[PDB]
Amino acid sequence: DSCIQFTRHASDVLLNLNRLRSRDILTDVVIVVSREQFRAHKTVLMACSGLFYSIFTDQLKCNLSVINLDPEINPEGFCILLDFMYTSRLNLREGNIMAVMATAMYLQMEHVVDTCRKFIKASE
Amino acid sequence: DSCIQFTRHASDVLLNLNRLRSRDILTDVVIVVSREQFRAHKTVLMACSGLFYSIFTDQLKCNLSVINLDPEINPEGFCILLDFMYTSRLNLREGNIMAVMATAMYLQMEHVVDTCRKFIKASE
């Protein structure tokens, strides 16, 4: 086509989606990770994660307001990944890298899994 | 913070949101523009438009499944802007620029209004 493109549009959309999440506006699901609860938008979770994409395209699970993750999932690792989904920024630290990589593998977030593998390889 | 950032994350999220729109997955509103209907996600519309942000933060309108726009709004102009919201690409042409600018003014999409003004000024 002959379209023009606004470079900052995708980033501005994601920033506003994160502002809606922070103010709990039109969030339609709560993700339960052991004793912890995280409110989010199903569309953003699907757009970022192969696991959520599969869950919310399922004809019965698409209608659930609560999703319980596997008990082995670490709430902090999930929190870091949820923040990444809504900001593009990943808080990867020596103290959390193992939990973040395991959570990214479970959530099917291949780019996160990739950077965790590389950061671990460098420390070996 | 000490975060790392994935450059293509925002663009990849928007691409997946557009794929969900194309397959009519988790769309929660229909925008009526005279004889034409457009299905969308309320969160994306709010993230892109000052008008939709005001509508869907309203305690009664947040729950409506149908929103009717002003009869002066051109369906093609709306379609072009809805495509822009979900892709960052604006199909701006001599034959549609007036309808696109008027629709962008109504929807409160200031960056679109700005490029329309500049493209019109250049042709004068």
Binding site: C3, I4, Q5, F6, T7 | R89, L90, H111, T115
Partner: peptide, 4 residues
């Protein structure tokens, strides 16, 4: 704005 750019030409993509």
């Amino acid at each position: 704005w750019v030409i993509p």
